[PDB]
Amino acid sequence: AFCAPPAYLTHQQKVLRLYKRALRHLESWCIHRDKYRYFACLMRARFEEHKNEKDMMRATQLLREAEEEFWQNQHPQPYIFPDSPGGTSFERYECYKVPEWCLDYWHPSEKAMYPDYFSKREQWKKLRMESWDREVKQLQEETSPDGIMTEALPPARREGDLPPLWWHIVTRPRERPT
Amino acid sequence: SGYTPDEKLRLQQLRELRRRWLKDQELSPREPVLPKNMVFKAYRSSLFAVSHVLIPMWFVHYYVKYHMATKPYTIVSSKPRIFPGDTILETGEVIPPMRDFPDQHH
């Protein structure tokens, strides 16, 4: 979520992803906790006994065979956390995640209903107003002339300065706004 | 691997500003600035019954009697069950009873 995906997943990343997915489907199959712990220790033993492979072509072949076995033995209806995608309560509160720019469009009466919060709001907007020019200058400095470019972003490298493109991250709506 | 110093420093500063923005989402104690109970059976349920039930009772019953029975075939009901031994109110006659019931084993 908070980290941008790279160009490719390394072999270690693929192995750890397969390990986590296999253990999740293992607990989905096992249901009961002692049974899950037993079979999870068995699967950990399997991964450990194939851990110290030195060829890496045999490691890629073992990864391919392992994921074929995983796709054959996976749970048809695995356990999905409710806040995770595919879950029951996934994207449930997006109908309440109202973006912060409607407060610019409220009437003066509704603004007068919340005076000091709005005073803090123009404080935040003015801070954004100087920081935007500073961060555009910083991002123009940080860009390499040519070559690889990733989605990662630099931080503020001097005092009194804010990380570039901070507004949409900091001022995002709360996960449970209501 | 772990967080790069490029990204670990950014997330530390981004989350620090995230605490301040969420801190500013709080409300003052004066917020928002907005410009005969008896018991339940004697007032709460009695005023509801005489206003939301008794008042619509009268307007409905006026339409039922004086605006539905005046039209010919509006309220039509099936004939009531007439058993032997019953007496007709409108006519005043008595339907004769059944036969002698030869089977009474149970």
């Binding site: 009437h107 919060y117 | 989402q25």
Partner: peptide, 13 residues
């Protein structure tokens, strides 16, 4: 209680 400000559209209009 720790009440928090909720963001709403302009329902005044």
């Amino acid at each position: 209680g720790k009440r928090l400000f909720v963001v709403k559209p302009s329902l005044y209009y």
